[PDB]
Structures are given as C-alpha cells and as structure tokens.
Design a protein around this nucleic acid. Structure first.
Length: 52
DNA sequence: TGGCATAGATATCGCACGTCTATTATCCTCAGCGCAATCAGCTGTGACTACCT
C-alpha cells in the first residue's frame, strides 16, 4: 500500500499548501467534476473519457 | 489392494442497493431614461400719443 499513493489535482495540492512542479507530466488522469466543461462529456459521450 | 466417480463443507466474485458531497451562477429592487393633457411666456394685433409739415 505504501506503493499505492493518493493523487490529487494541482489546485487540490494548492489547497493543500503544495505546488505541483512546473512542466511535470500528470502521473494520473481521472475524470473531473466541474461546470459546463464537465457536462460536455454528457453532451458528447466520446468526450466522457477524453477529459483528463 | 489401487485409481477415480461422486457426495459434502466452504467460501467467493459479480451484481445490485442505500447514501453522500462536491472545490467560481441565478433572482427581487432602486435611480435614471422615456410618453400623454394644461398653462404661462413669446409672438402677433389693435389702439394711444409724441413728432414733422
């Protein structure tokens, strides 16, 4: 489990008093919950897994 | 005596049900712009009077 780390979004780390290092490739890509950018996935199902 | 069909005990993963929290928009109300019938000051009309011949 120590190899299993809990990953959070860049702004989540900012809320957690941490800064994501600039230019880093995101280790994990998950779905997000947002405004209309979120619902665009529902509007076009092909974009449901496209939003990273 | 020896190998394997078959009955018993034990979980086990897939599928569905009950529940929660997200990390950046919408809806009443006021001061400032308008449209429609009178009324006073500008303008037009009639009369009084100084001035010239």
């Amino acid at each position: 489990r120590d190899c299993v780390h809990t990953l959070h979004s860049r702004d989540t780390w900012l809320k957690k008093a941490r800064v994501v290092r600039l230019g880093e490739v995101p280790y994990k890509m998950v779905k997000g919950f947002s405004n209309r950018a979120r619902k665009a996935r529902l509007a076009e199902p092909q974009l449901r897994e496209e939003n990273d």
